[PDB]
Design a protein around this ligand. Structure first.
Ligand SMILES: [Mn+2]
Ligand SMILES: [Mn+2]
Length: 543
């Protein structure tokens, strides 16, 4: 709940990966987070009943509703939607006021992936999200998807952003000079707390290169270590890393970098009801889509963090007061677009979810839509991003949802031929990245969903042997056969042969065309992958 007693010298109110989600919505955690044996059972790879047990969270509680897919639909009906900028603002303000009334010091920290991927964002090229950050009063933020707006727009938006953007790693690609401050030291009574920022290191290979030309985001352990050391030389007693590296990478850094007391981990969209102790560092994840506000109270000492209290505060719009200024602001911004954004396109008869290592009902729906409009397509590759939303049974799908699921600034759907060998290699290559069993390199991640294909995955097999028994359209994969593929949200088209006469157009236009026509959809979970050595789980899709 929200009525917490005072604790410590400083309070951090942290959220991450909002992905421009302006309104209350639903967001189910993944039914599977598959890992090779060495990585199983650790934060970042917990789901379902196991995550509840790991954290000692009772089944059926508001925290259980946020934390796991177990009982999802039932709990969504019980507790209501999560997030919304209005409710998140109300909660942040409630907590900050409480802390300041106690004579405490509070900082509002945003872990990045904030400005993009929503109707509000696309309609304003991120501007409305920044204006919202300003209404709440965000002290710092880091970045990742922000860069898909392009360097020019990001700089414009940083002019508007009243908080202080941090990043030790964004440097010029020719001279190496950092473009932003690495950290900021804040007075917390008699102590000094440094907030160091880290943006996603893989922006260049993850998005169109044009968006970040002239910049390097490379993970630079030396530069990070020197930043931590410098903050301490300037008087910082404790050091907090506001990170967008991904939680597993943050855990690896905790064992390599000296002096990081706490890491606020974004990117992987994880939940950590209790902090994860790695080396001499505590790690707290930032969740996603506005579902939670992480309150981290710190008892500091001359040399670091003596102790801390972590609470995952559910952002439940039905259980929080309104932030009137935010409600009014959103009304002003979207009044002209409400018809477009909220009119039903179709009704979903069952649960549409996005997150999972391998398969989702939302991605299957997209595959069906693509094949319905382009019957020549044999395989549809959907991007396994961790942002999105969840549609409940009987709920209408709207344009706002389409933008929540497919609101890339580069949303083009591409149709192109791939040889069978390429299809298999694409999956094997992703598997090698997502599943490496070497704890030194593991970072995790999700696998592209390929509608029209079925395969067997063995996460523990050697590279080159993880993907087997591939079948396309009920027939064994023919390595030399040319198959017509479709893909959006990535770079797969670069190794294909473009379909003659086809003009790439936004995936959401294709989806809206399909949905308007069909009126109602019913996508029951029918996973197309068999996982060796694991039980593949599914949620309950009715109710
Ligand atoms: Mn994200
Ligand atoms: Mn990210």
């Amino acid at each position: 709940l929200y009525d917490l007693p005072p604790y410590g010298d400083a309070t951090l109110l942290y959220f991450s990966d909002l992905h421009g989600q302006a309104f209350p919505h639903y967001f189910m955690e993944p039914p599977n987070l598959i890992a090779p044996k060495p990585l199983m059972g650790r934060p970042g790879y917990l789901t379902g009943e196991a995550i509840l047990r790991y954290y000692g969270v009772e089944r059926g509680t508001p925290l259980a509703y946020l934390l796991s897919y177990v009982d999802f639909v039932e709990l969504a009906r019980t507790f209501g939607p999560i997030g919304g900028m209005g409710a998140l603002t109300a909660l942040i303000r409630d907590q900050k006021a409480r802390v300041e009334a106690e004579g405490g010091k509070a900082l509002v920290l945003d872990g990045g992936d904030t400005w993009t991927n929503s109707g509000l964002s696309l309609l304003t090229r991120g501007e409305a999200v920044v204006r919202w950050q300003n209404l709440v009063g965000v002290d710092h933020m880091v970045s990742h998807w922000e860069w898909t707006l392009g360097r020019e727009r990001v700089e414009e938006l940083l002019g508007l952003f009243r908080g202080e953007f941090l990043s030790y790693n964004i440097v010029d690609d020719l001279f190496g000079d950092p473009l932003f401050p690495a950290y900021r030291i804040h007075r917390v009574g008699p102590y000094a707390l440094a907030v160091v920022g880290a943006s996603y290191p893989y922006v260049k290979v993850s998005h169109p290169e044009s968006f970040t030309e002239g910049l390097s985001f490379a993970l630079d352990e030396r530069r990070l270590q020197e930043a931590v050391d410098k903050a301490r030389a300037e008087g910082a007693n404790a050091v907090v890393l506001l990170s967008h590296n991904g939680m597993q990478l943050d855990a690896a850094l905790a064992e390599r970098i000296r002096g990081i007391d706490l890491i606020l981990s974004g990117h992987t969209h994880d939940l950590t009801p209790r902090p994860w102790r790695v080396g001499k560092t505590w790690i707290v994840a930032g969740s996603a889509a506005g579902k939670a506000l992480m309150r981290v109270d710190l008892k500091l000492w001359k040399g670091g963090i003596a102790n801390l209290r972590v609470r995952v505060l559910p952002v439940l719009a039905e259980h929080l007061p309104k932030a009137e200024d935010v409600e009014a602001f959103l009304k002003a911004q979207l009044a002209p677009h409400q018809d477009h954004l909220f009119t039903p396109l179709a009704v979903s008869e069952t649960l549409l979810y996005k997150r999972d290592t391998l398969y989702s009902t939302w991605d299957q729906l997209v595959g069906e839509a693509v094949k319905a409009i382009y019957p020549e397509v044999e395989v549809v590759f959907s991007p396994a991003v961790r942002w999105g939303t969840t549609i409940l049974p009987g709920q209408a799908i709207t344009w706002d949802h389409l933008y929540a699921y497919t609101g890339f600034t580069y949303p083009e759907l591409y149709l192109f031929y791939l040889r069978g060998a390429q299809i298999k290699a694409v999956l094997e290559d992703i598997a090698s990245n997502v599943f490496t069993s070497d704890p030194f390199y593991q970072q995790g991640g999700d696998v592209s969903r390929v509608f029209g294909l079925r395969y067997v995955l063995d996460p523990d097999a050697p590279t080159g042997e993880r993907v087997r028994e591939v079948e396309v359209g009920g027939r064994p994969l023919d390595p030399n056969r040319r198959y017509l593929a479709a893909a959006y949200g990535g770079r797969l088209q670069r190794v294909g042969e473009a379909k003659p006469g086809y003009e790439p157009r936004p995936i959401y236009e294709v989806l809206a065309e399909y949905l308007r026509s069909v009126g109602r959809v019913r996508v029951r979970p029918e996973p197309n992958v068999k996982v060796i050595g694991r039980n593949y789980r599914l949620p309950e899709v009715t109710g």
